[PDB]
């Protein structure tokens, strides 16, 4: 009310400004555009590096004594003597499994049953989306050849941002599309039970007490997404050893 | 007072968050209590016919608004704040 | 911030500002905003203190209206001060 | 800790290598922030034309066009504000106390200004923003007061700079280094305002003392730095980008 009933010439000024405000929206609109591309632009540079990690973990490729050499220094330079060697086994056993158990928000969601499943997790990829709605996809690559639970070769999660940018000029999470799972046995089905793999089956928009609850998990869902995106994937290595903590 | 309320929430419950609606309720609580106390202090000033509202009118306004025990602490935290405030120079 | 000088989390500045805009009196003391700021901080701390526990009892790491309602109604006094703020005015 | 320590010779080496791949990962992330910085700078050059445009509309320097006026109402109604609607019927110079009223709402900042600071901010015409561009990455906020009206100080532009330490953070993004304010020149110790708690102390950022070690003075002068950087954030990512609504109260 400290503006409603006041001078006119003033308000008049505001109206024009309110217009230039809109001009910013479109300018900030174009911003997020090239902004999104830049990120995806470098993701293609991260993948090759992470792919290397995948094979090194899956044992599909032996470590390069050079990488081992540089590792010796790096680890020493970071005062992480805990990972050194002075004077058998396949790829890093239970890599992402351990890395996730150290990830703040995620770790808690894993159960003793779904933990044995994540034991076959080989890698977690990332891909943005310009294929329509803004967003990204978290591809979980499991070892189908050994996974006794589900035959699925690649599980995933897709977060979508509503076309229209929010007030802040940024994106706003619209909803998430789970990549579901095809278990080969109910007894082997960890997921209804409180399981981690329910992550691929997030809550939907439509459905007191209801919204209040169906919003906390909905919020927790997006929260987890960022954890894997801005942390787990980028610093997966440290997340496994625990240095990221 | 969203942020100031969040900080306090961390001083008592570091591992506890708060929803948007819950925050809106807390904001109303603060503004509500504020107007109540200030409302009294305002009267106390007029009653005693004074043109100023010091920490004195606020204190008594707390004894009249807040219940026994609850008002007690309020008087404690308030008196302490004023004591420390004046000290810092 | 005058809040630091008083060791308070709440803004001693705004409280002092609002006290002069609410037309409660011709003038406002210097210790008035500090004393009031402390009181407000306490109450909010007293609420979130119990509201948080309620959240835990219900296995929740984030406080919601439901929780705030629990802490207030379970506390004999809080279930009282809110009423004073309410004011039926009938 | 003891978990990784008991890892077989084979295992460890497997980690050592990965620890290296991450280093190579750090390398690319470095270039990411680079283009990320430049790109974000590119668009700022586009934001200014609009802000520099509104500044005049705020200083009564330039007058609104009937096109913008009408176009505005269609927006006020579209957003359901109404507060910006004029009455049916056929004074001052460029909207009075604009930025002042604006900062009066901004969450973090609002609770910093005092009655003696309001009179000063009453002469604030605009709040700019610019990325250092050259050496040492970072942004600088510019405050332009009416030198021919401001009775407090002769300064025309009060600046503030936030330097991002060259060394990229662990997360892969920029990390603060220190704030370098732009001292003010008051025209009278009475019209000083700033030692008491004042808003303009924002132009006198806390300095990283030394490694002499202290107690409570390292935590206190830390919460202040956080507040300093915090305030800087507000103005940059909020106040400026949406000053219009921050003045009305919609942004709230």
From Swiss-Prot, chain B:
A single GO molecular function term of this UniProt record: DNA binding
Coiled coil spans: none
Compartmental location: Nucleus; Chromosome
Glycyl lysine isopeptide (Lys-Gly) (interchain with G-Cter in ubiquitin) crosslink, residue number(s): 84
Record's comment on post-translational modification: Monoubiquitination of Lys-84 by BRE1 gives a specific tag for epigenetic transcriptional activation and is also prerequisite for histone H3 'Lys-4' and 'Lys-79' methylation.
GO CC, alphabetical: nucleosome; nucleus
Keywords, alphabetical: Acetylation, Chromosome, DNA-binding, Glycoprotein, Isopeptide bond, Nucleosome core, Nucleus, Phosphoprotein, Ubl conjugation
Origin: domain of life: Eukaryota
Glycosylation sites: 76
Complex and partners: The nucleosome is a histone octamer containing two molecules each of H2A, H2B, H3 and H4 assembled in one H3-H4 heterotetramer and two H2A-H2B heterodimers. The octamer wraps approximately 147 bp of DNA.
Function in brief: Core component of nucleosome. Nucleosomes wrap and compact DNA into chromatin, limiting DNA accessibility to the cellular machineries which require DNA as a template. Histones thereby play a central role in transcription regulation, DNA repair, DNA replication and chromosomal stability. DNA accessibility is regulated via a complex set of post-translational modifications of histones, also called histone code, and nucleosome remodeling.
Entry's family note: Belongs to the histone H2B family.
The protein, known as: Histone H2B 1.1
Residues of the full protein shown: 38 to 126 of 126
Swiss-Prot record, chain C:
Keyword annotations: Acetylation, Chromosome, DNA-binding, Hydroxylation, Isopeptide bond, Methylation, Nucleosome core, Nucleus, Phosphoprotein, Ubl conjugation
Modification after translation: Following DNA double-strand breaks (DSBs), it is ubiquitinated through 'Lys-63' linkage of ubiquitin moieties, leading to the recruitment of repair proteins to sites of DNA damage. H2AK119Ub and ionizing radiation-induced 'Lys-63'-linked ubiquitination are distinct events. Glutamine methylation at Gln-89 (H2AQ104me) by FBL is specifically dedicated to polymerase I. It is present at 35S ribosomal DNA locus and impairs binding of the FACT complex.
Subcellular location(s) of the protein: Nucleus; Chromosome
Post-translational modification N6-(2-hydroxyisobutyryl)lysine, affected residues: 21, 59-60, 80
One BP annotation, GO: heterochromatin formation
Positions of post-translational N6-glutaryllysine modification: 80
Residues recorded with modification N5-methylglutamine: 89
Modified residues (N6-succinyllysine): 80
GO molecular function per UniProt: DNA binding; protein heterodimerization activity; structural constituent of chromatin
Annotated family: Belongs to the histone H2A family.
Subunit structure: The nucleosome is a histone octamer containing two molecules each of H2A, H2B, H3 and H4 assembled in one H3-H4 heterotetramer and two H2A-H2B heterodimers. The octamer wraps approximately 147 bp of DNA.
Role noted for this protein: Core component of nucleosome. Nucleosomes wrap and compact DNA into chromatin, limiting DNA accessibility to the cellular machineries which require DNA as a template. Histones thereby play a central role in transcription regulation, DNA repair, DNA replication and chromosomal stability. DNA accessibility is regulated via a complex set of post-translational modifications of histones, also called histone code, and nucleosome remodeling.
Listed name of the protein: Histone H2A type 1
Species per Swiss-Prot/TrEMBL record: Xenopus laevis
UniProtKB/Swiss-Prot annotation, chain D:
Subcellular location: Cytoplasm; Nucleus; Bud neck
Domain of life: Eukaryota
GO cellular component terms, A-Z: cell division site; cellular bud neck septin collar; chromatin; cytoplasm; Gin4 complex; nucleus
Keyword Oxidoreductase attached: no
Post-translational modification, as annotated: Phosphorylation by CK2 is required for normal progression through S phase. CK2 phosphorylation is not required for correct bud formation nor histone binding.
Positions bearing Phosphoserine: 1, 17, 23, 59, 78
Alphabetically ordered keywords of this record: Cytoplasm, DNA-binding, Isopeptide bond, Nucleus, Phosphoprotein, Ubl conjugation
Effect of residue 18 to S: Predominantly cytoplasmic
GO biological process: budding cell bud growth; NLS-bearing protein import into nucleus; nucleosome assembly; nucleosome disassembly; positive regulation of microtubule polymerization; positive regulation of transcription elongation by RNA polymerase II; protein localization to cell division site after cytokinesis; ribosomal small subunit biogenesis
Main location as per UniProt: cytoplasm
DNA-binding region: 217-243
Region Interaction with NBA1: start-end pairs: 62-249
Cell membrane recorded as keyword: no
Deletion consequences: Exhibits a large proportion of multinucleate cells. Elongated buds. The percentage of elongated buds is significantly increased when GIN4 or CKI1 is also deleted. Small decrease in the percentage of cells with elongated buds is observed in NAP1 and CKA2 double mutant. NAP1 and CKI1 double mutant exhibits increased sensitivity to benomyl. Increased resistance to benomyl in NAP1 and CKA2 double mutant.
Miscellaneous note of the record: Present with 8070 molecules/cell in log phase SD medium.
Domain observations: The acidic domains are probably involved in the interaction with histones.
Name recorded for this polypeptide: Nucleosome assembly protein
Annotated source species: Saccharomyces cerevisiae (strain ATCC 204508 / S288c)
